[PDB]
Paper text:
The structure of NMB1585 was solved to a resolution of 2.1 Å by the multiple-wavelength anomalous dispersion method using seleno­methionine-substituted protein. Overall, the dimeric structure resembles those of other MarR proteins, with each subunit comprising a winged helix–turn–helix (wHtH) domain connected to an α-helical dimerization domain. The dimer interface is thus formed by a symmetrical interaction of the arm domains of the two monomers and involves contacts between both N-terminal and C-­terminal regions (approximately residues 1–25 and 110–142). The spacing of the recognition helices of the wHtH domain indicates that NMB1585 is pre-configured for DNA binding, with a putative inducer pocket that is largely occluded by the side chains of two aromatic residues (Tyr29 and Trp53). Thus, NMB1585 appears to be pre-configured for DNA binding, similar to the structures reported for the HucR regulator of D. radiodurans and a MarR-family protein from S. tokodaii. The residues in the recognition helix (α4) that are most likely to be involved in binding in the major groove of DNA are Gln58, Thr59 and Ser61. Overlaying of NMB1585 and MTH313 confirms the presence of a potential ligand-binding pocket in NMB1585 at a similar location to those in MTH313 and other MarR proteins. Therefore, in order for a ligand to bind into the binding pocket of NMB1585 a conformational change would have to occur in the protein so that the dimerization domain moved away from the DNA-binding domain. Interestingly, the addition of salicylate, a prototypical MarR ligand, did not affect the formation of the protein–DNA complexes, suggesting that the protein does not interact with salicylate, in contrast to E. coli MarR and MTH313. This may be explained by the occluded nature of the putative binding site observed in the crystal structure of NMB1585 and suggests that the protein may adopt this conformation in solution.
Residue numbers in the entry:
A (entry chain B), B (entry chain A): 1 to 142
């Protein structure tokens, strides 16, 4: 079949597999996007989390409501609107995310065993290049 | 930073951008899955479509009900349920699907013209391998 078809089926398969691993961590993709980013990158904005994990603002806002009510995250104080202020894991959040970061590193190590870092850097640059072409072609059509 | 993090963000971006392109045809992933499979492969069961595009059976049946009600698709006749029966584009469905296959083929030629076919093979093989290891590791972790 067509290359686009070959790509589309593949990426959808692999995203589903990644979501399945997240499910094993007793989370969903949306919760993971917030929890994992803050655990690994430190303090980040809702905008950043949403752009990183390709989620709309409302998705991120929703998950942040729930996590903040569970006392797991907090927004840094400031004059800016809440949504623009830096989000951070609380102490309970850090404890809650510790297992997640560990099991992520574990899964990451098994998973990339056959790849070198040279190969993966290139694969990641390939995916980026792929995304760029696709976005640019889409922009043209708009 | 982390390999898994780098992979997860990038596959979800491609998946997103693919969905965005589909949306620019004024469709969605679920409809595309049925319409595009049928237009390019011919007759297929709901199961084949569901497996190819990584969609649950309920989702597929729902979309098929809508398209049949619009006279765009049809089940062949037989002494089994329609869900295990061959799905076909009607005449009105083929005219309906024509512009979609054309824009898909146009998108595919524009994207992969930049990406290159040896590099496309490399991306596919790497994604295949990653998906393989990930599935196997998740299976073990149960």
């Amino acid at each position: 079949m067509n290359q686009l078809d070959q790509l589309g089926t593949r990426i959808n398969l692999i995203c589903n597999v990644f979501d399945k691993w997240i499910g094993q961590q007793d989370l969903n993709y949306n919760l993971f996007a917030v929890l994992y980013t803050l655990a690994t990158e430190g303090s980040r904005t809702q905008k950043h989390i949403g752009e990183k994990w390709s989620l709309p603002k409302q998705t991120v806002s929703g998950v942040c409501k729930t996590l903040a009510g569970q006392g797991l995250i907090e927004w840094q104080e400031g004059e800016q609107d809440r949504r623009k202020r830096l989000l951070s894991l609380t102490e309970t959040g850090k404890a809650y995310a510790a297992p997640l970061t560990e099991s992520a590193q574990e899964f990451s190590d098994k998973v990339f065993a056959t790849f070198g870092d040279k190969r993966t850097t290139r694969l990641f640059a390939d995916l980026d290049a792929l995304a760029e072409v696709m976005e640019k072609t889409i922009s043209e059509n708009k």
